Design a protein around this ligand. Sequence first.
Ligand SMILES: CC(=O)N[C@H]1[C@H](O[C@@H]2[C@@H](OC[C@H]3O[C@H](O)[C@@H](O)[C@@H](O[C@H]4O[C@H](CO)[C@@H](O)[C@H](O)[C@@H]4O[C@@H]4O[C@H](CO)[C@@H](O)[C@H](O)[C@H]4NC(C)=O)[C@@H]3O)O[C@H](CO)[C@@H](O)[C@@H]2O)O[C@H](CO)[C@@H](O)[C@@H]1O
Ligand SMILES: CC(=O)N[C@H]1[C@H](O[C@@H]2[C@@H](OC[C@H]3O[C@H](O)[C@@H](O)[C@@H](O[C@H]4O[C@H](CO)[C@@H](O)[C@H](O)[C@@H]4O[C@@H]4O[C@H](CO)[C@@H](O)[C@H](O)[C@H]4NC(C)=O)[C@@H]3O)O[C@H](CO)[C@@H](O)[C@@H]2O)O[C@H](CO)[C@@H](O)[C@@H]1O
Ligand SMILES: CC(=O)N[C@H]1[C@H](O[C@@H]2[C@@H](OC[C@H]3O[C@H](O)[C@@H](O)[C@@H](O[C@H]4O[C@H](CO)[C@@H](O)[C@H](O)[C@@H]4O[C@@H]4O[C@H](CO)[C@@H](O)[C@H](O)[C@H]4NC(C)=O)[C@@H]3O)O[C@H](CO)[C@@H](O)[C@@H]2O)O[C@H](CO)[C@@H](O)[C@@H]1O
Ligand SMILES: CC(=O)N[C@H]1[C@H](O[C@@H]2[C@@H](OC[C@H]3O[C@H](O)[C@@H](O)[C@@H](O[C@H]4O[C@H](CO)[C@@H](O)[C@H](O)[C@@H]4O[C@@H]4O[C@H](CO)[C@@H](O)[C@H](O)[C@H]4NC(C)=O)[C@@H]3O)O[C@H](CO)[C@@H](O)[C@@H]2O)O[C@H](CO)[C@@H](O)[C@@H]1O
Ligand SMILES: [Ca+2]
Ligand SMILES: [Ca+2]
Ligand SMILES: [Ca+2]
Ligand SMILES: [Ca+2]
Ligand SMILES: [Mn+2]
Ligand SMILES: [Mn+2]
Ligand SMILES: [Mn+2]
Ligand SMILES: [Mn+2]
Lengths: 237, 237, 237, 237
Amino acid sequence: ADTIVAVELDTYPNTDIGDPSYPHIGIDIKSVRSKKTAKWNMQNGKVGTAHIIYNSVDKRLSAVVSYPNADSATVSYDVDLDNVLPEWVRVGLSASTGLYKETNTILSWSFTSKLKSNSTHETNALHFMFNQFSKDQKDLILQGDATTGTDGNLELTRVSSNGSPQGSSVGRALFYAPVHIWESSAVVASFEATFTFLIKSPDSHPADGIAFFISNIDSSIPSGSTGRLLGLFPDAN
Amino acid sequence: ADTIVAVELDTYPNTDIGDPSYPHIGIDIKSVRSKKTAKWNMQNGKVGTAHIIYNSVDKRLSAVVSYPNADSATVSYDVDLDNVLPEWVRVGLSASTGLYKETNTILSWSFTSKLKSNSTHETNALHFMFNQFSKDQKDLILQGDATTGTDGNLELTRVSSNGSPQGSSVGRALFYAPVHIWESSAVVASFEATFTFLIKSPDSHPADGIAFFISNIDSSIPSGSTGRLLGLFPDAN
Amino acid sequence: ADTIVAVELDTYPNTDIGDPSYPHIGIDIKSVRSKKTAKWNMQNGKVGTAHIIYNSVDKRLSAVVSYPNADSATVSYDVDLDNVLPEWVRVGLSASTGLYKETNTILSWSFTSKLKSNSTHETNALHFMFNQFSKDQKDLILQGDATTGTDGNLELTRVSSNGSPQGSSVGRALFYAPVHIWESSAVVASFEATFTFLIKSPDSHPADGIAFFISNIDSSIPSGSTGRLLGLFPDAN
Amino acid sequence: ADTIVAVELDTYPNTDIGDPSYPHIGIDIKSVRSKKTAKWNMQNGKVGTAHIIYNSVDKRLSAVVSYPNADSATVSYDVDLDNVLPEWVRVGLSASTGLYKETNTILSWSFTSKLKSNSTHETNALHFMFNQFSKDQKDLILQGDATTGTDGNLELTRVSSNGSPQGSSVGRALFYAPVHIWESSAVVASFEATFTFLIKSPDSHPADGIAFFISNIDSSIPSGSTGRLLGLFPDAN
Ligand SMILES: CC(=O)N[C@H]1[C@H](O[C@@H]2[C@@H](OC[C@H]3O[C@H](O)[C@@H](O)[C@@H](O[C@H]4O[C@H](CO)[C@@H](O)[C@H](O)[C@@H]4O[C@@H]4O[C@H](CO)[C@@H](O)[C@H](O)[C@H]4NC(C)=O)[C@@H]3O)O[C@H](CO)[C@@H](O)[C@@H]2O)O[C@H](CO)[C@@H](O)[C@@H]1O
Ligand SMILES: CC(=O)N[C@H]1[C@H](O[C@@H]2[C@@H](OC[C@H]3O[C@H](O)[C@@H](O)[C@@H](O[C@H]4O[C@H](CO)[C@@H](O)[C@H](O)[C@@H]4O[C@@H]4O[C@H](CO)[C@@H](O)[C@H](O)[C@H]4NC(C)=O)[C@@H]3O)O[C@H](CO)[C@@H](O)[C@@H]2O)O[C@H](CO)[C@@H](O)[C@@H]1O
Ligand SMILES: CC(=O)N[C@H]1[C@H](O[C@@H]2[C@@H](OC[C@H]3O[C@H](O)[C@@H](O)[C@@H](O[C@H]4O[C@H](CO)[C@@H](O)[C@H](O)[C@@H]4O[C@@H]4O[C@H](CO)[C@@H](O)[C@H](O)[C@H]4NC(C)=O)[C@@H]3O)O[C@H](CO)[C@@H](O)[C@@H]2O)O[C@H](CO)[C@@H](O)[C@@H]1O
Ligand SMILES: CC(=O)N[C@H]1[C@H](O[C@@H]2[C@@H](OC[C@H]3O[C@H](O)[C@@H](O)[C@@H](O[C@H]4O[C@H](CO)[C@@H](O)[C@H](O)[C@@H]4O[C@@H]4O[C@H](CO)[C@@H](O)[C@H](O)[C@H]4NC(C)=O)[C@@H]3O)O[C@H](CO)[C@@H](O)[C@@H]2O)O[C@H](CO)[C@@H](O)[C@@H]1O
Ligand SMILES: [Ca+2]
Ligand SMILES: [Ca+2]
Ligand SMILES: [Ca+2]
Ligand SMILES: [Ca+2]
Ligand SMILES: [Mn+2]
Ligand SMILES: [Mn+2]
Ligand SMILES: [Mn+2]
Ligand SMILES: [Mn+2]
């Protein structure tokens, strides 16, 4: 079973499995039942921005989601990633739909990871920035229904040619190269991710959400993880 | 008076004004009496590295000081900088000696500040990195006994030609350009500073320490700030 | 008697002083009479992007100006900056209008300067990025009619309250901190500048242009350098 | 066959296949017979630094190799990479030994690639920096005799326990993720690579050299490319 650490932008509330009674953002550590959440005033049809940050000194994972001229939603949680994730991982974006749908369009995504070992200026780093996605994005591993190229955007879940979202869809996009997230000999290790999305829904209550996640290198979409499971978890435990 | 926020690498314990009975690192908010401190195993004659970080989401200021092949001292403190510092500040390094002395050599210094406002990828940033200092460092405002050029280093406090430290010396070096540390319309604001130093001392107990600070633009060394005041405070209150 | 090195986005052809008989971009070394130019299909009312680059290895200064879904204008020129500019300079943007006007709006501006001396990874660098300008931009030195704040933009030349550009106007904005552009002991020295502008003109032929420039630290707008002189030169020599 | 663009630090002169009669640095475009070379005063036993740069505006590939306190060798060549390399490539380091040997130790390696298309601040970038290599470097694809971990360095060619180099050895190390080197809709595309090496040789004339290269994603060591072929070319055409 995959080891997952994710920050979810949960648009549909599934109270039966622990979700709060409204759209929210949460920090999930190995389970879809968020260890911490915050109310999120999702704005249907508007481009928003998510920013995730973490550093080994504070051992605190935080996320801020906001829309232009609007209050931002903030969530933070104390977690020592050394004891949760393996040394090498893959980072990515996941999204899903179930009975209800929504577009899970990613317009830009950037990631920076830095490791500082016990030495002078000896800092190892990885940084990638996508402000436009091409049809053949060789450095991205697309899983499920995720596709790129449509107007230079990344569509995590299935969308029809006329532009409408489909139900029962799952898709992920992971950066090709493995990332060295931590090391026992690192004085300081830190990462930062940012991505802009566009969640549009024609129906009543949009579903299900988008999630930025970190996982074991060989992770793949668990079978039957559409809907509430966000393409990350095998069950709702 | 000046508004000061600093991270001190205090080498001499002044128990009468609140210092712990050993060398330590501390976080000072408008007072030399550190709001929080941590034991620091200072290594006389060795080059060490200090790393300070802060972000508006966690509103937590942290510092890590370490020497190659040795544990690192860490100190953190929750503080909302919007309520302590003016919108525009100047960042710098300060050091002093009193009855006892030590060299306060800075071998490198780097700083990165980022402000993200309510817009797409509209991030304002400033970054400077000095790995060598010249005799005529036009982008540094030197105050007190601070000088540059000797072997490409920055000597905060007075050192004679033969290479030995002088007592009752104070010196600071501030980056020329003002830094926009925070803004009411910022989704995320964060900064990071790093510097390597070399504290060498002929005497028994070295004194007094080095400090990375942030202050009002027009700040200058308070009178009598040699010794325990680290060139930052006018009194010990 | 300022030393000026500039890349001009010349909107009005002043053939009496050497201009080609059409809008163009040019590389000026100490004189308004460009050492090299290239035809530029200026698009009234549209946001464009200028990108300037230079490195001490090739000792070649190049610039590219372009608008979306349009051909870009390119101009390059071989010049050893060590022999033209002082070691320390200030970088900035300049603009002017004469009998004819146009708005000289700057929507963003970034600059990166790197110096690599004779040592291991010993690189000195400076980088600043403005994606939004505030009313009180303390890190910018505004000269002439230049102002900031209007919608988060930088208006190099005077614009009335309704939005119409004014004739006979000059404005410049220089980054506060001096920049160490070159050093005799540098293995590699290089810089890069990028800025987006919006030139709008209600009249027949727009005038006069915008220019990215590098100068001696104490430079200021020369007397009567409105119009064709772009706020950079004292005369048309 | 593979498409190769490389910058070689050739330590052994093979006059028969076109090499100058002294150690040199050269730019190879699809052939081991450099399109341009420059004399290189290789210093056996000392750590050196290579720096490669290129940009689509000047369409010029340049390299600078140097040792602390010594003049540097420089070589440049005009080449439009859009017409030589496929859109997606992999970048790496190669080295080989033949009848004669030398150690081809890489102590650090960094690369930055940027693509700016017809859009506002829409820049795609990739950057990685290794200042230490681990035993299990998951983001590197090691080919041939290349190994990592020995004192935190990357040994491109076979070396023994006591530290001496072996003859008839070839090794390469490519960054895991493919790199989007150019795009028809890019206003500016550029890259920069830097690496520090240590060439030590106990015998008469060291051989054969180190090379930084760019190739088609699926490139692999051609059969019998030890010696003068540098693990890059199938023959000496
Ligand atoms: C076709 C498909 O892709 N199927 C996926 C599947 O998707 C799930 C599907 O769920 C539809 C409904 O399923 C159940 O009936 C309920 O869970 C229902 O949720 C509402 O009711 C439950 C129980 O009463 C509540 O706990 C839950 O919070 C929710 O409440 C409703 O919330 C709205 C908004 O707040 C409110 O306005 C309503 O009043 C409130 N209803 C009530 C009665 O109070 C589901 O709607 O589609 C969902 C949305 O797309 C997914 O989230 C579901 O997962 O999932 C499985 C497993 O993950 C997958 O394998 C399958 O392919
Ligand atoms: C010349 C100059 O620049 N003067 C500065 C001046 O510098 C100060 C000066 O202080 C010297 C001594 O001053 C007092 O005598 C004491 O504060 C003494 O400190 C020891 O004693 C006090 C009081 O008993 C203790 O509270 C304090 O912790 C310290 O204790 C001693 O600590 C050592 C190490 O742990 C231990 O080995 C001893 O056993 C212990 N002593 C006892 C009795 O227990 C000072 O030494 O020089 C200092 C060092 O350079 C500075 O830190 C002082 O600031 O400062 C003023 C005001 O800031 C400035 O204006 C002036 O120019
Ligand atoms: C009020 C103010 O700010 N004054 C500035 C002043 O600004 C200058 C002013 O110039 C206006 C005209 O001045 C002269 O009459 C001419 O130079 C004229 O330029 C045209 O004519 C000359 C000479 O014949 C040509 O060499 C030149 O290319 C231009 O040609 C005309 O171009 C258009 C477009 O291509 C074409 O359609 C016309 O047919 C063609 N005319 C002819 C006869 O062929 C000036 O227009 O305003 C200018 C524009 O705003 C500025 O560029 C001028 O500098 O400048 C001084 C000194 O710099 C400053 O101190 C003063 O305050
Ligand atoms: C074991 C192995 O890995 N083999 C590789 C193989 O490696 C090659 C091998 O070459 C050894 C010698 O091979 C021939 O004898 C010559 O090419 C010789 O080179 C010298 O002589 C030629 C011809 O006369 C000159 O053109 C050439 O420049 C060189 O000149 C000598 O240079 C020195 C220094 O300037 C000077 O002092 C000498 O006087 C001068 N000699 C003369 C006669 O003038 C080779 O030495 O090992 C080499 C070094 O390790 C490799 O570079 C060779 O490639 O290569 C093949 C093909 O790539 C590979 O498949 C095989 O596995
Ligand atoms: Ca949910
Ligand atoms: Ca003290
Ligand atoms: Ca003109
Ligand atoms: Ca050779
Ligand atoms: Mn949830
Ligand atoms: Mn203290
Ligand atoms: Mn002109
Ligand atoms: Mn050669």
